[PDB]
Amino acid sequence: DCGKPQVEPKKCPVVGGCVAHPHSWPWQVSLRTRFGMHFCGGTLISPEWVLTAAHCLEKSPRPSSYKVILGAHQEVNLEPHVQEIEVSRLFLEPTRKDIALLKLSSPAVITDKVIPACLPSPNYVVADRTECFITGWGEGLLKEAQLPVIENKVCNRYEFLNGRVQSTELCAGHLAGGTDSCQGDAGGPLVCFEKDKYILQGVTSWGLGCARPNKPGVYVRVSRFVTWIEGVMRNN
Ligand SMILES: NCc1ccc(CNC(=O)[C@@H]2Cc3ccc(cc3)NC(=O)CCN3CCN(CC3)CC(=O)Nc3ccc(cc3)C[C@@H](NS(=O)(=O)c3ccccc3)C(=O)N2)cc1
């Protein structure tokens, strides 16, 4: 059952934002080096598959360099029931896009704290001003922020990101500054509530800094990679 947290998320009263309600984002994963240090996020999209950013894997093409922590809220002292699962294979997107799949060495156990996010339909375009959520441990409690999507044609204006955003990316952010995903959130989810569940629409990718005025974050547009993702899962 994807996209439906058993523990309901709360909105705020990651730079800025607020601490998430514990386990309300049950697809959020922490990507760690074999040494155990958190450095990137990811999203569980099925029991055996995590989606992350390709740049998070820049340091090593060896699956043994990585492990995934599922079900966590605190980053350092992992709570008793947290799942640590190794990675058996890495799949970088084949056209140098900032997205990648991790096949876990064993399927995650689905529980009230470990649940996959839903994937969008191919080529869906999140509408301008849609309020979505980003989550992560970045720049030790899991944080969230609610940010509005900014349509690419506005985001690509000189006043904002000046032609840098591709159709395979989306923009989201508060243009006054102060609230944003940042480095340790890379690879993690941008999700949007659709009808009754959360759909993974973006993968935290890059920005001109973090939380700066007129510089919204850039996310890989997951809907442009669903067909590729499905083919990798089907054939591996
Ligand atoms: N929500 C804010 C937020 C900010 C950062 C992060 C963590 N992620 C990074 O660190 C990324 C890592 C990255 C991502 C994608 C890359 C290459 C590298 N490649 C394509 O996806 C390949 C396809 N193609 C490439 C070209 N682009 C389009 C897409 C267009 C463009 O210009 N892209 C661009 C890319 C990288 C950078 C700058 C610009 C450098 C740096 N930005 S920064 O200002 O120096 C910085 C300093 C301090 C703190 C944060 C940022 C920056 O973000 N690197 C999470 C969240």
Q: How far is the CA of 85 from the centre of ligand 1 (A)?
A: 28
CA 32 – CA 66 distance, rounded (Å): 6
Resolution of this entry, Å: 1.5
Residues 213 and 137 in one domain: yes
Q: Which residue has the tokens 């993690």?
A: 188
The answer to whether residues 162 and 92 belong to one domain is no
CA-based nearest residue to 204, from 123, 147, 161: 147
Is any ligand 1 atom within 6 A of the Cβ of residue 93? no
Q: Are residues 139 and 218 in the same domain?
A: yes
Q: 212 in ligand 1 pocket by Cβ < 6 Å?
A: no
| Residue 4 within any structural domain of the chain | no
Q: Which atom of ligand 1 is nearest to the CA of 185?
A: 55
Structure tokens at 224: 């442009």
Same domain, 165 and 92: no
Query: Is 231 found in the same domain as 210?
Result: no
Distance 205 CA to ligand 1 centre (A): 6
Q: Identify the DSSP state of 92.
A: E
Q: Which residues of the chain form beta strands (DSSP E)?
A: 18-19, 28-33, 38-46, 49-52, 66-70, 83-92, 100-104, 131-136, 143-150, 169-172, 189-194, 197-206, 217-221
DSSP 186-225: TT-EEEEEETTEEEEEEEEEE-SSSS-TT--EEEEEGGGT
Q: Is residue 90 domain-resident?
A: yes
Cite the DSSP H helix spans in the chain: 152-155, 226-235
8 A C-beta contact, residue 107 and residue 126: no
* Residue 156 beta carbon below 6 angstroms from any ligand 1 atom: no
Give domain status of residue 81, yes or no. Answer: yes
> Quick check: is 121 in a domain?
no
Q: How many domains does the chain have?
A: 2
Structural domain for 181, as ranges: 131-223
Distances (CA, A) of 229 to 72, 92, 121, 234, 236: 25, 10, 12, 9, 11
Three-state SS at 54 = helix
Q: Ligand 1 centre from 186 Cα, in Å?
A: 10
Residues 188 and 149 in one domain: yes
Q: Examine the domain organization and report whether 88 and 149 are in the same domain.
A: no
Could you give the CA distance from residue 19 to residue 143 in angstroms, rounded to a whole number?
A: 4
Give the three-state DSSP class for 162: coil
Does 213 fall in a domain? yes
Residues 110 and 141 in one domain: no
Q: For residue 21, give the H/E element and its range.
A: none
Does the residue 124 lie in any domain?
no
Indicate whether 67 and 46 sit together in one domain. Answer: yes
- CATH for 168: 2.40.10.10
Is residue 183 domain-resident?
Answer: yes
Looking at the domain assignment, is residue 3 inside a domain? no
Tokens of 130: 């849609």
The values of phi and psi at residue 215, to 5°, are -135, 75
Instruction: Let me know: does 201 contact 43? Beta carbons within 8 Å.
Output: no
The closest of 180, 179, 201, 203 to 192, measured between CA atoms, is 201
DSSP bridge partners of 163: none
d(CA 171, CA 148): 9
Residues 164 and 218 reside in one and the same domain: yes
Are 150 and 98 in a shared domain? no
Count CB-CB contacts under 10 A for residue 177: 17
Tokens 């959020």 belong to which residue? Answer: 28
Residue 206 Cα: closest atom of ligand 1:
53
Distance 220 CA to ligand 1 centre (A): 11
55 lines ligand 1 (CB under 6 A): yes
Whole-number Å distance between alpha carbons of 107 and 43: 14
Contact (CB, 8 A) for 9 and 133:
yes
- In this structure, the residue with its CA closest to atom 52 of ligand 1 is 206
Question: Same structural domain for residues 107 and 161?
Answer: no
Tokens 């900032």 appear where? 98
